[model samples]
Target: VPATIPLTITNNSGRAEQIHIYNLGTELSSGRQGWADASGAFHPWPAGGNPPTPAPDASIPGPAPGRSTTIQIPKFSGRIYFSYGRKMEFRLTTGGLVQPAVQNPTDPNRDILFNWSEYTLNDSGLWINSTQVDMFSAPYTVGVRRGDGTTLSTGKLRPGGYNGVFNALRGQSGGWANLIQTRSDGTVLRALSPLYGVETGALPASVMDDYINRVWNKYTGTDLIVTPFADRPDVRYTGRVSGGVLRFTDGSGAVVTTFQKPDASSVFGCHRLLDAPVRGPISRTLCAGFNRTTLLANPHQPDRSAAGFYQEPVTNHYARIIHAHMADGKAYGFAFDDVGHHESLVHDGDPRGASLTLDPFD
Candidate 1:
């Protein structure tokens, strides 16, 4: 919160009328620069349902009223602002017989989200895709680990990769290597919460890895700094940065993958949700109970419309998004989809001074 903020209302129109000052959260474009989900259709605001509460019940008394015939300056009006939120509910209004609620049956009291738009029924693309990484296929499936120890799946990295315990095995630590990965833009994505108290499996695997890695390192262990992919350990986290590339590291502070920045001749292609079929080798059915899927599908699939699109579920995989700062000091937030990508590795073929580029806002 700012100590002091200036308010500007250029009343260029001479005729003055008492504006009720209804701070409605009407749907509007988030004036972000690039690579952000600044579109509308992705955002949905419940029409008649009550808005998600913002702050904890403060029990702070209401402001005192001003004297008659004078304006009562609000002590807490413009100083605070709410943001938009997402959710899963079975409401009678939405044609529900028993009333729809949280997506996972584990938590019924859980309110899928907070309405940051000040309870307004309009949607904004803001905070829709502000995440810095992606989780294992968008809408990561959740389930229990089977007895067969070999079964495994991966979570997503905002930029693609995860945090795990890695031993050098037979390599040194000081080497500088890089990791190569594909970019599948336009896919769905999700976040995962760890298998901890009250908030178990809150995010997808990839998101869960970030949460676990960060939370663990921040409060428990050491920070796992991935050196480069050229020297990956037995196991580690990996993810996309820009173009069709990824970065990751094992817990040993060694870079587990090679790194490559985006250039003019690159495409930001993402594997669409269709690639990870909701009922196939890595579908939700496969990960029914586990916090994340363990299927062995290719992380990068070139054709989404074909098969193996381990779609991220809307309910389990999500982030408690934090919106970027607004010049006016307004608070904002939202939920968005994240999906992984798959591209072919063409060796020494099209290097004829040709060029390729990704769409700025796709």
Candidate 2:
């Protein structure tokens, strides 16, 4: 079983002050890195912001046993760094103490609350002013070298798999754009399209298949063959008329939305994280593009009154697919799925898309 060293601030005194602690050890050697910056690039975690502030210190009396202070290392756990080895120790300690100039010494520096090197682990100790105290401590084999290729341990998941998908989507040269549609029935819907100055039949099926495969591989770790609209018996196709008309009511009591069939009434499984304009405080949420509606004469067009399901209130968590063409062949129909957190979880899923704009000529 892996063990954890619960670090805490067990005491305080002399003056009234604040204490901060966090897992900021950089090299596990001399204890140097402990902060971060605005971009969250190797900087300190704020008290309650992005990088999150340091842990509060133990008050004058501090909390009790299980409450005194804790880091909660499971059990028999391992160290975080491997470069420094046993040559260094990483643990939590009381930063120091503070005193009121009115009744106590003006300077609290003389009163050591806690010291990193002067404490013992698994043992109880007394507290003094400004003396750094060890709340918890542990040691392990941090600096181990791979005797062989197979023997080396991989620290975390690789990013190449996710990046590979992004590269693939970017590799294909195409074009796409954003648009809004108003069906003849008076219903409105948002739409997206390729920048290519051609009709749906003009676009290549290979392009659509590539987008689908890339999206699947990027997010789900799966690669199902992307069949062409003409080949898919489920997906409707006027022989590539206006990029294939797909119609699902915006709210006519339809349970499903998809390109497979009109009577199917199944909601399209694909989604989109449309990019909108970033404006005021409320507009802050308007970071994605708008939706549009058009006659579903083809599988690639949008339909507001079409019977199907649609995602609302798009955030970084919710992602969707758009089927549109771009003029810059470079960005034509690029997939834009949420990468998530930007820091915690780098990539969300895959860069996928579905025809979102009105079928060309529709």
Candidate 3:
């Protein structure tokens, strides 16, 4: 891998609107936060005030319809934000860059049509992904060309998949349609992830109660076996819900860990009650099981295969609808969506260059 790789952003949105691009992240080489210029030169940020100073114009000229803009990306971990018809507003605070938060009604970029792809280009090579962990907006795919001239990519929405997600969410009955945010002019902007939808009060906090209730009830009397690691299949933990907490015990029948009954937000956000850490692999498995809506169907921890995920009526329809419309049936629906190695991420240790392709909406 070179010190910097050329990244190509192809525009095929089938729109005449101009596009603007920006590269912002932490420099892996020095572990400092900075932004890359159009030529890929890194610039450190100035001190930010309490009120947050407006960030400098970091926008790079983007491609027009049926064209492409190539820029250099250094060894950094950050995001590539693309906006149509406008340069996005960014602010810098004492904490660092204050990114646009559409979840807030007053966020400056709330009405803007834009989305971002997260990437980390470093000594280990490049890891780029099409993230819907926040919201599902534009149709795009990420890819990396390897030393062998082979391209590995993901996050390509199935044809019509761009509109498919919003349409599917529209009639979801349980206030799921409220997650879709549209402009006053009738432009379908984006759909906040269920976690954000609940946080913003757009979707009910109890949206997933029906499923969580059934899982706890069924596992209360029956044993729930959780084999955390795929390679360490021999090591297993078993649990059963008592009261409202699920306690897991090792093969020796000694208790390992316990979990309080998690709410819909806990499952959707993959945190709080289900935070995944090195010592807490059980939480990761449980988070995946809940988001995939496979806890009740499979006694096995992950149900590694894609089959049987989100088939339940009261499951995570947000994640279900997104995956159903993706070409690979993968997405970063939640933080732990990569549990079964099912995420819209493209990685190459010896990458030549990277690409972010903008797909058409219609």
lDDT of each: 0.20, 0.20, 0.87
Model 3 worst lDDT window (10 residues): 271-280
Which regions of candidate 1 deviate over 4 angstroms? 1-26, 29-191, 195-362
Best by lDDT: 3
lDDT of 2 by residue, 45-75 (tens): 2234332233332212222322223333221
Please say which candidate is ahead in TM-score: 1 or 3.
3
Best by TM-score: 3
Q: What is the per-residue lDDT of model 1 for residues 253-293, given as tens digits with 9 covering 90 to 100?
A: 45444333211111011112212230122221112211222
